[PDB]
Ligand binder design. Structure first.
Ligand code: 4IP
Length: 127
């Protein structure tokens, strides 16, 4: 699944119910954003399918180079996603938005472009 990735790199992500920022290694592939706690981890911490989502730039009080993934068709609608819990649970995400912070302005632009291209490339886009 992780072979032939569209982009890989470190990004800071804001939590769902609990609003805490975590540094995660992201992998964009198969029109999904997989994230890992550590780069060499065998298992992803979570997966965010990009189908039906949009991206928009945002300004954050503390974190620079931010953007958000959100569902444009249904405001306030929880984004379909799946992640693991320390106790072993595999559960659905609780995010209405995914606020992400990139390491640099350039990396923000590259990530936003890669994600948008992935979403548009999907043959089942807007269906
Ligand atoms: O560690 P604490 O301070 O509790 O914060 C956690 C982490 O930010 C998790 O991120 P990660 O999974 O990358 O570790 C996040 O899961 P998401 O991955 O869904 O953002 C949790 O979201 P909730 O389960 O919605 O609270 C949030 O509670």
């Amino acid at each position: 699944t992780f072979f032939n990735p569209d982009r890989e790199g470190w990004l800071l992500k804001l939590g769902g119910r609990v609003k805490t920022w975590k540094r995660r290694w992201f992998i964009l592939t198969d029109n999904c954003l997989y994230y890992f706690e550590y780069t060499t981890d065998k298992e992803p911490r979570g997966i965010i399918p990009l189908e039906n989502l949009s991206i928009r730039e945002v300004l954050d009080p503390r974190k620079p180079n931010c953007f958000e993934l959100y569902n444009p068709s249904h405001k306030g609608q929880v984004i379909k996603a799946c992640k693991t819990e320390a106790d072993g649970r595999v559960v659905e995400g609780n995010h209405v938005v995914y606020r992400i912070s990139a390491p640099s302005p350039e990396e923000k632009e590259e990530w936003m472009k890669s994600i948008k291209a992935s979403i548009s490339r999907d043959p089942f886009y807007d269906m």
